[PDB]
Design a protein around this nucleic acid. Sequence first.
RNA 1: GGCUCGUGUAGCUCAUUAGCUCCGAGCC
Length: 17
Amino acid sequence: GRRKKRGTRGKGRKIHY
RNA sequence: GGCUCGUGUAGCUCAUUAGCUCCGAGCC
């Protein structure tokens, strides 16, 4: 919720803050 | 193009930290 909230960049590219 | 990769104080679900989109190194 209220946070970076992203995970992947749209193709399993992930986000890892 | 296209994929992987990756916080980019880049968006949506804003409670939920992952799942989709953006695009740079790489080949060219």
